[PDB]
Amino acid sequence: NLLSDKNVAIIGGGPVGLTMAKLLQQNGIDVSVYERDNDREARIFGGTLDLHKGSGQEAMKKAGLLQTYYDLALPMGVNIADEKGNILSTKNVKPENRFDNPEINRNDLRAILLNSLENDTVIWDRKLVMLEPGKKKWTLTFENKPSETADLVILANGGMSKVRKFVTDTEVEETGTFNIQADIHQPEINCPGFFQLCNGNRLMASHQGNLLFANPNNNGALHFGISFKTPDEWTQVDFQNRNSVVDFLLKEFSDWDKRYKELIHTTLSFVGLATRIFPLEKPWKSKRPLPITMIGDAAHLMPPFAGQGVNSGLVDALILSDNLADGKFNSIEEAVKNYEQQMFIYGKEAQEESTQNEIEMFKPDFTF
Ligand SMILES: Cc1cc2nc3c(=O)[nH]c(=O)nc-3n(C[C@H](O)[C@H](O)[C@H](O)COP(=O)(O)OP(=O)(O)OC[C@H]3O[C@@H](n4cnc5c(N)ncnc54)[C@H](O)[C@@H]3O)c2cc1C
Numbered sequence: 001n002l003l004s005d006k007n008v009a010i011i012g013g014g015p016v017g018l019t020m021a022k023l024l025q026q027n028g029i030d031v032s033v034y035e036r037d038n039d040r041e042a043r044i045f046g047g048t049l050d051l052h053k054g055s056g057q058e059a060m061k062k063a064g065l066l067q068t069y070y071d072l073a074l075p076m077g078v079n080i081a082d083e084k085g086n087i088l089s090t091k092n093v094k095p096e097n098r099f100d101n102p103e104i105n106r107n108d109l110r111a112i113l114l115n116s117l118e119n120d121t122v123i124w125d126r127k128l129v130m131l132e133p134g135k136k137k138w139t140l141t142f143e144n145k146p147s148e149t150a151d152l153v154i155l156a157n158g159g160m161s162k163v164r165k166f167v168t169d170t171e172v173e174e175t176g177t178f179n180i181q182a183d184i185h186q187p188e189i190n191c192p193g194f195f196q197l198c199n200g201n202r203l204m205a206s207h208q209g210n211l212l213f214a215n216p217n218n219n220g221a222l223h224f225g226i227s228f229k230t231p232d233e234w235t236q237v238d239f240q241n242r243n244s245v246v247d248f249l250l251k252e253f254s255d256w257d258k259r260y261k262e263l264i265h266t267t268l269s270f271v272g273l274a275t276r277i278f279p280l281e282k283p284w285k286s287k288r289p290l291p292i293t294m295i296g297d298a299a300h301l302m303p304p305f306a307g308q309g310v311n312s313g314l315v316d317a318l319i320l321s322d323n324l325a326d327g328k329f330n331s332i333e334e335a336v337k338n339y340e341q342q343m344f345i346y347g348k349e350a351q352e353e354s355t356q357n358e359i360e361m362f363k364p365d366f367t368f
């Protein structure tokens with residue numbers, strides 16, 4: 001093993017960093033995960049994730065966690081609707097497709113990963129702020145906590161990682177769209193009309209440049225997203241004030257059936273975020289002081305409009321761990337390089353599809 005008298009620091013305990021830690025730990029490699037979250041019960045905001053056969057599910061299979069993923073995940077139909085609430089198309093789960101890509105809740109996935117690892121693999125309340133290369137080890141700086149050291153740092157700390165300079169100078173870019181997200185609890189009570197329009201399936205509608213998506217059953221909460229081209233005026237809506245977000249959305253959704261408006265009216269709080277991409281446009285630095293790399297959204301953040309996200313990141317996990325597993329290479333450096341080479345190819349394919357589908361969907365006359 002290349003890592004024999006060494007240790008690995010994974011920065012970030014997302015699904016990709018925790019899968020990374022598991023695939024390494026089952027090969028006897030000494031890894032820690034350093035996670036900003038205060039403790040393992042912190043709520044992860046967001047929709048559900050779906051792991052695909054051939055990618056995500058391969059990583060889970062390699063981890064021995066596939067069946068656990070299946071047990072906790074929920075396959076779902078898809079309804080496409082118009083702005084008037086007409087169902088244009090219903091695609092139900094067929095028994096033979098049940099396992100293709102079942103929806104799992106993000107805390108549920110994290111709990112599966114965390115349970116899979118040895119005790120104290122993950123070190124909570126650790127926010128990496130600085131990285132410094134030493135003689136033979138990285139020194140790792142964490143806000144108000146002891147510093148630590150590692151032979152190999154894997155950055156897994158998501159799309160907005162601030163500690164990427166030693167791998168690449170490339171910067172995150174805005175793509176021109178924007179997403180507003182929210183949860184509604186007791187959706188059967190609080191948005192009955194909309195809840196009944198979803199009728200146990202996911203829901204998508206498209207009208208005049210505004211896209212609505214919803215999953216009515218993320219562990220009992222409805223999660224919806226509203227996406228659109230960033231208005232040129234923007235920020236001129238304040239996501240801390242629910243009144244200004246409501247006003248903006250009721251204006252944009254004036255044309256839409258009352259059931260969708262009710263959705264907006266009953267939401268307590270909204271999260272706004274500009275869509276971003278970390279583009280795989282140019283090779284990463286070949287001159288590097290010590291072995292360091294990136295996986296997941298740290299490596300290839302891309303728009304979430306073709307289901308590309310976590311799966312390609314799980315594949316990074318699989319490919320990197322296989323590579324670091326063997327004496328197949330002469331050096332950690334070579335193992336990292338080979339991984340980075342494959343990831344550029346399937347990464348860039350994914351980003352091309354995200355971008356392309358993003359262009360496609362926000363064409364004024366788009367129809368699902
Ligand atoms: C609105 C939206 C919808 C999406 N829908 C889908 C979808 O349906 N399907 C899909 O596959 N993908 C989807 N994605 C993308 C998906 O969420 C990401 O690909 C996935 O979560 C990336 O996993 P990750 O582990 O690389 O990063 P993350 O999930 O971002 O996790 C990074 C982890 O690092 C921790 N961290 C951050 N900074 C630090 C630090 N300095 N020190 C220590 N720890 C740190 C964070 O706490 C977080 O725990 C969506 C994305 C968005 C924005």
Ligand SMILES: C[NH+](C)c1cc(NC(=O)CNC(C)(C)C)c(O)c2c1C[C@H]1C[C@H]3[C@H]([NH+](C)C)C(O)=C(C(N)=O)C(=O)[C@@]3(O)C(O)=C1C2=O
Pocket residue numbers: 047179202204213214215223224225226227304305306307357361
């Ligand atoms: C083209 N759109 C419609 C699309 C396509 C695919 N599938 C593919 O691209 C598959 N690629 C093939 C066709 C196999 C080559 C898709 O897989 C998806 C989507 C839509 C998104 C919407 C995402 C959204 N994000 C942007 C916040 C969101 O709010 C929700 C939600 N439930 O509230 C989503 O579900 C969303 O995350 C998501 O998962 C999408 C798709 O999965």
